[model samples]
Target: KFPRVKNWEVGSITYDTLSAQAQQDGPCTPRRCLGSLVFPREQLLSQARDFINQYYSSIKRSGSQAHEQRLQEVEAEVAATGTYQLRESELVFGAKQAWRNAPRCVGRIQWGKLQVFDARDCRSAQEMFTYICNHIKYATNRGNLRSAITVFPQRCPGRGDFRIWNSQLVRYAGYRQQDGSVRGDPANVEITELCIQHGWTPGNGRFDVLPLLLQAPDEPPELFLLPPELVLEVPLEHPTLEWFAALGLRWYALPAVSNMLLEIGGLEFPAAPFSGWYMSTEIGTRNLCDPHRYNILEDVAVCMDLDTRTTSSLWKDKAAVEINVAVLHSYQLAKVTIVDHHAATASFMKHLENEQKARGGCPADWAWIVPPISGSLTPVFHQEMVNYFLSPAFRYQPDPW
Candidate 1:
């Protein structure tokens, strides 16, 4: 059995192993494999019953009679068919609970209000594309981003599954230049190559909204182009630095993750994509500043005319701050919903407190709960958090070919 590992850095030797484990959690890469850990049918049954009871209790319908009735029904069905299907209301509740139980997310205040799209009956790649486009339109909400989850069908015992190859509903294409440099988001270099090999025409620009590589059961993957109007983007610029616009940087307003599995009561919805509004540091400090991604720290530092030669100059730190400042300012200027790390971390604390009251405790990954740029500046950094798996969870899944 493969051991579960989390928070591994991207572009490292362990990244492949991390993704392999992630794929087990939901789905993330092109290679398909079962979870590294053992997931027995008895454990599934146990978790399912627990989740159903929690679902009933959450809606103020808790009783021994109603609870026992549902448990018996689930047990009888699983005994007969080896699996039990969730009701529509149950699916919605489970989806929201999954978001609430997401340990890595800092934005769980909006967990209960997520828009859940049910695409379980979708049978074709085109249908998946339609559902995804609708999800994007609804979630974007014309720059007022709303948290959402679009769930495809659950994994069936004998049937081939529906899969979305792209990690997110919206992403930029990465083009590897002839001179060993990347022209776009380098993080997507693999998916970009996959798209190209599948006959997708490469775009020249930096922030090209990548087409969806939708794969249905028993079908080859197909590319579906995203409508430009449906994809809202924020043109990143500083409030005062006019030259920041000259850098030609932009990011999609919606951060809907498409590859992760939504695990409810041991049942895996491998094609469940969930999203929330971005924290400023996610784009500014990590996406743009990370050495493997845009790697713009030096460029931005050079533009700011800071000393780039020495580590003692604190040039990278200063540039990261301004970039993050610009991200917050630009989003605010464009009337988009965005949260700074300070505000987000504070809200997370509130979420933790509320969860403690509601569910006994909150699960959080400390490395992720703390922001990358200003770890010490946030209150979350000073607090201790315990992380663990809970039912109705969103997890990484193996990639589909």
Candidate 2:
């Protein structure tokens, strides 16, 4: 039953106060927690060695065949490392810093769904991704070191009573096996399938760029490097609108105005007014379109990058989403030349006038709910636009993207 006094505004104000109070408290104490205690790097490594050996012994005894025992041994070895104790918070904080230091990783690394290591021996996917970046950096000069690989599938595979709701980030669940033997699709040629079938557990696995880019110094390819290069090492100029479209946010795109300012004025693209949008008429000719889509709308897109909180439980308010996006398919790079809201409204009104003479029906707008798909006992949300893309990567996994 509804409250008779119409105290919704009052209730909302009170709830906000309560939530702010709660944020002051961090992850709870371990007294009643079920998972293993997460220890620092040096401490965890020392303990993991012994744990791995014992785990292998137990697996060997339980196994029915030789092959099964070997598989279990490998799993146990992987599991015994710092993989077990890593947390979601650590990864997010670490990744965010890496991106800032080297902005190139921005589109590359995604907020992957959590994949808890289940077996006594397997490493988590996050562990693998972190390790790959760390080790690779040790070998190269382009050492921005960003861990961008993700493990969670777009679809969540139902596991017993637990099920992942679609339309969110999914997690790496680790390799699936029966009696210590892996069961995978033999016909799948793409390496992605193999990675999924034998995913290292979340917070454990490390992602290495499968096809690495190795360039020679003299006349080296200066493209996908992170941390926008200035006048010398890499060009800091903004990419052409055509190039921006090619990047599609997953890739960076800069306009012509940005390129000129950086070259002549010695300005940064991500700082100041340019970060919003750069405007020019005498420099460009006349009647220019607004470079940034953000300027047109009152409540436009909600950004989910550094300096914003996406995983906060407080973000779930229904009104938080201004435009209810029902479809988030990967699409052609949207252009700024697109009509403004006022123009769009006018166009629609004109269409309605024409349509009233024929059909009476109109398309209906729907609300969408994007839940967290992090595949852990404790899932978290990504701080950006709720990932609405339908990729096998996030299919069934449940983490709020």
Candidate 3:
């Protein structure tokens, strides 16, 4: 049986036949359904065998002589060393597939366009800093950002894993200031403190970029500061509010996520950092406005001289809208690649249709797919979705420390 999905705006319906293929059960049962829940590959031989078969089928050579040989070689190698390596082509396909299969990503429309960098040859933390720097420069593209992922060496058996301690390749240093208030992004306080302990002289500003903490098997993380030129900042300004420019707020153009583990053909790449251009809502609403984040909503409302003493005044909402406007306007005026919630959700709708035609159905999380601000206004809000797991996935791992 398939799940019936409906697009309320268009009054159209589709059956998600793909959910039946889910090997693991979701947090739902006959008794209760945890639809709002927020939060696998150890069998190396069989997993690798099936993955290669999947790979072979992808290139239109299933069960062919070449496909059979690929299967045999993996198993043969695994028998000798309990693990095997993936070909460059296989790793590229695996990373792209993982991006496409990620249920929480609304940017799946750009999955096939990723530039995969093979850093599996890297042997030390120093080499990792170089590879990472190159990735930032390439992806940033001097404001014309491109989607890319640099794959570090895969986790090996009986060996310490290669790791990037920071969650994102670029993050603001969050210093715990006097009176327990944070000086920078509160979300990154722990990482910032760790950097200080590791000999990184701390910055006292609100937007200082944190250095990288790269770990090569069994070694403590090495701190390498990102060259300021490679880190592009978009100075936020409002289209209508002249005073908004005086706020002097800015954000990095490249949002390279460096923490997640990439699982492909039963091999784990613990330091695969992927990046793409920012979506306005992500920076405007979540990063700057969230209480645990910069939490600038009230400050902006105060500057606007809105009556914040009462909830009926809608001062917070007004400031939130203006902040989003500034984010979109600033990115556009700076000639950087940025998408608003409306355009992103519209493209996602097209991606859903394309997936239906090509792959039966797409796995999506409605909670994540929907934009944070103006939930009902976005097209994805009305679209009912069925979420499930798929192979070649990115899994969030614990901090290496």
Candidate 4:
């Protein structure tokens, strides 16, 4: 069945034919539609065959001897070892395909341009830390951020899995004070406590970077501190409001997600750390201004000398705009790579158009695609989408507690 995706503003419609290839069904079953809910695998041979078929077709070698031989080889290997390894080229292809198939990312336009660093030979937590540091150094590139991912060893049966405990490669520590309030990014409290419990010295600063908890198979997590030079940070300052710098806001240059599991064919990689430059709204609106995070809107609004008591005063709007402005100005002032929501949304719209023609549909979650602030102003606000699971995807893995 085809799902019709529409752009409400322009009234353009496209029937999604790609959904037919989704191996599993979504939550809807001719009853109540839970499309907004998080739509959260399979026999190994079947998945491997599907991935191989996809790989061969991508290179236009479908039905060829090489393709059939490759399939036969995979079948025999799986039958023999109960699992198989992907070829070098297959790994690279699968990484990009996973990004391309990502429903929530607005930066899929750069999916094909990812630099995949294969660290499959990494054997210990120390080696994992080294590979990760290299990833950070290369991705930062002295503010010229590059889209890159460092993939560690895949999961093995009857063995502990390799994992990075932090949700991201770079994150500020959140300390839960005795007064029942949190300092730093509140989202990171659990990880911070875990790090402290693991014998890491706790820092009192709000923006202190947390040490990494890297875990190798059958071993307890080891703490690894990222070098200050390796982590590039931009101090937040407003272009017009001079007093904004006094607040001492800052954010990192690289947005490397480390906890995600990367699955290609039948193999599962539990320690693939992926990084890209930040979208300004991600830091300005979501990270800094979210109620559960920094909650800086009221502070900023009050600092701007606005009437916060009145709901219709639009004080929140004014502060949010300035915060976004500060995020862009600060990143630009520091010469760090960043994309504002307007430009990001525009590029995403172009990406949508390209995907419609290239793949007959693009898997998208409208809620995640649209920017948090200035929702209606962005081009993505008017677009409708279809969501489904796709293979070779970055998936959520539970914490290694």
Q: Each candidate's lDDT (Cα)?
A: 0.81, 0.21, 0.90, 0.90
The count of backbone overlaps in candidate 2 is: 47
Over the stretch 83-168, how does candidate 4's per-residue lDDT look in tens digits?
88888889999999999998899999898799999898889899999998888999999999999998888886777889899999
**What tens-digit string does per-residue lDDT give for candidate 3 at 169-213?**
889989886799998899999999899999799988889999988
Off by over 4 Å in 2: 1-46, 54-298, 301-327, 330-401
Q: What clash count does candidate 3 reach?
A: 0
Q: Residue by residue across 260-357, what tens digits does model 1's lDDT show?
A: 88888768888987778999999999999999998999999999999999999999899999999999998998888899999999899788667756
Using lDDT as the yardstick, the better of models 1 and 2 is 1
Clashes of each: 11, 47, 0, 0
Question: Which digits, one per residue and each the tens of the lDDT, describe model 2 over residues 305-401?
Answer: 1222454543323212211110011111222111222233333334323323422211111111111111121111111111111101111112211
- Candidate ranking under lDDT, highest first, comes to 3, 4, 1, 2
Q: What is the TM-score of each candidate against the true structure?
A: 0.88, 0.18, 0.97, 0.97
Error of 3 at 325 (Å): 0.5
Those runs of model 3 whose alpha carbons end farther than 4 Å from true positions after fitting are: 40-42
